[model samples]
Target: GTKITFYEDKDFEGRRYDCDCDCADFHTYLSRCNSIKVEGGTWAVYERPDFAGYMYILPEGEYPEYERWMGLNDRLSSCRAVHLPSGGEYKIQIFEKGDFSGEMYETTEDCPSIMEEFHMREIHSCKVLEGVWIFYELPDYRGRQYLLDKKEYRKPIDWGAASPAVQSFRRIV
Candidate 1:
């Protein structure tokens, strides 16, 4: 491959933050989300500098559309609009672009809101960064994250692992 630019960080003088990794796709990154089973999905984010964006994941075992990425970014984590997947329409919001250890964000209507108002059939993990504390979206649960799993996950529980309880033993974050 030609020389590649791994958009892994955005720096401003002494301030620096983690960016998306070129080596990992969105689902791959989501799978690495410590305690979430993020299958059958992908993501988009606003790329700094060049301003041109890129896609990280695609529907599992399916091909992603070459176009239709970065539909929103200004409203991180809370896009007021819904994503309609009609005629193969693609929509994604760049919620959080960069963070201390990594980046986090959410998809619009296509993905479920942690609020649980609307049933999100295509659910995805949001804002997962290694070594960073992941507090629950609401309810103030002392949840955490990890990088490995010994148990298997059959259902999509809080933590991706098959364990019913949120896996908190590893505690990397």
Candidate 2:
């Protein structure tokens, strides 16, 4: 079972809000989020309601404060659990445009540099067929990162990414 607790004040103080599923409007339950404890499962916290605004992907762990977890600020208004793969071979595909359109590139192994295989500069959409993976904006797993699971991303915005450009990726093994 997944259980995540939130606090309105720093150091796990003030009002509390527990979430195990999607919260479209967490602000209605809690004034603000200053701290959190992800007892189980991975979670994505959003600064605005309906899973909008800056997004923060958090794995199962304790975060005494929002800033401690690399959050831009402590104004969480929505959150949802990230579905992780139980067990299976990893597979993924990158698209040059949204809605699975444009040139496509597929891979089953860890790619330190996407450019070497895809011969493309930007990835606009993606599909994760199995296992968990992380995409980086720069080669060798450097720069910004995006955590992806077994699912489909019709567009870059669907993955809560600030941009559609992805430079590298690797399986989370």
Please report the candidate that would top lDDT against the real structure: 2
Weakest 10 consecutive residues, lDDT, candidate 2? 141-150
Per-candidate TM vs. native? 0.17, 0.77
Off by over 4 Å in 2: 110-119, 134-150, 168-173
- Write the residue-wise lDDT of candidate 2 on 1-173 in tens digits: 88788899888889999887788887888888889999778887888898887767777888888766567677888888877667679999889888899998888988877777888878888998878887777788666557776499988777667788788888764
Query: What's the lDDT for all of these models?
Result: 0.22, 0.81
lDDT of residue 166 for candidate 2: 81
Per candidate, the number of residue pairs that clash is: 11, 0
lDDT: worst 10-residue window of model 1: 74-83
TM-score of model number 2: 0.77
